[PDB]
C-alpha cells in the first residue's frame, strides 16, 4: 500500500480569466477557488485525479465559470450586479469541482476590469447634472454682479 497523500488541505488557486461580457466588454476577472478533495470520494478521486488533483481540476474550471458568468452581464451590469456575478460563478464552479471529488467552500471574484467608456460616460452624466447647479447660482451671482456694472 502506497500512502496517497491527498492535499485535502483546501489549496486555494487564484486563477484569472479574461472575458467578453454579455455586451462583451473586455472584462478581466480573477477567482480564488478554495478546493478540498471531497473526502467521501477520495480513493475514486485518486483513480480519477491523483495527488496534484487541484492543478488537475481548478486551473481551468475556474476560467470556465468566470467566463460563463461574466459573459451574462453588460460592462456596467457587472459592477452594478457584481454580487450576482460572483454568486453565479461560485454556483457553477462548486458543481464543476465536485464532479472530481472537490468540495469548494468558497469561490469569490477577486478583481474586475473594463476599458473605461461605459462607466466613464455613466460617471460624467452625474458630473454634469450637478455642474448645472454649479453654474446656476453663478447665473444668480452674475445677474447681480451686473448691477456692479450698472
Amino acid at each position: 500500500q502506497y500512502p496517497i497523500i491527498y492535499d485535502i488541505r483546501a489549496r486555494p488557486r487564484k486563477i484569472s480569466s479574461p472575458t467578453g461580457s454579455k455586451d462583451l466588454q473586455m472584462v478581466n476577472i480573477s477567482l480564488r477557488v478554495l478546493s478540498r478533495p471531497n473526502a467521501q470520494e477520495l480513493p475514486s478521486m485518486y483513480q480519477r485525479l491523483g495527488l496534484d488533483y487541484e492543478e488537475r481540476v481548478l486551473p481551468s474550471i475556474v476560467n470556465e465559470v468566470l467566463k460563463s458568468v461574466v459573459a451574462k452581464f453588460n460592462a456596467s451590469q457587472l459592477i452594478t450586479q457584481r454580487a450576482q456575478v460572483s454568486l453565479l460563478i461560485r454556483r457553477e464552479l462548486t458543481e464543476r469541482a465536485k464532479d472530481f471529488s472537490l468540495i469548494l467552500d468558497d469561490v469569490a471574484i477577486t478583481e474586475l476590469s473594463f476599458s473605461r467608456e461605459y462607466t466613464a460616460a455613466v460617471e460624467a452624466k452625474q458630473v454634469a447634472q450637478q455642474e448645472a447647479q454649479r453654474a446656476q447660482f453663478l447665473v444668480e451671482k452674475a445677474k447681480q454682479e451686473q448691477r456692479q456694472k450698472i
Partner: protein
C-alpha cells in the same frame, strides 16, 4: 479564530453610477466548530483566499443601488 484584519478596497459604480471607491473590513474569526472544514475546503490561507473577493462582490452590489 482571531478576527484578523482584512481591508479590501473596491471600485464600483453607484446607482447614479459615479465611480465610487469603497473599502471594507472582514472581521473574520473562523468558526471554531467549522475549522475542520475551514481547512478541508478552505485551507491555511482561508482569509486571504476567501474573504477579499466576497467583500468586493457584496460591496459593489450594495453600491449599485444608491446614487452618489
Amino acid at each position: 479564530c482571531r478576527s484578523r484584519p482584512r481591508n479590501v478596497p473596491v471600485i464600483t459604480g453607484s446607482k447614479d453610477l459615479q465611480n465610487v471607491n469603497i473599502t471594507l473590513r472582514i472581521l473574520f474569526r473562523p468558526v471554531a466548530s467549522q475549522l475542520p472544514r475551514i481547512f478541508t475546503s478552505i485551507g491555511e490561507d482561508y482569509d486571504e483566499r476567501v474573504l477579499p473577493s466576497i467583500t468586493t462582490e457584496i460591496l459593489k452590489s450594495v453600491v449599485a443601488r444608491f446614487d452618489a
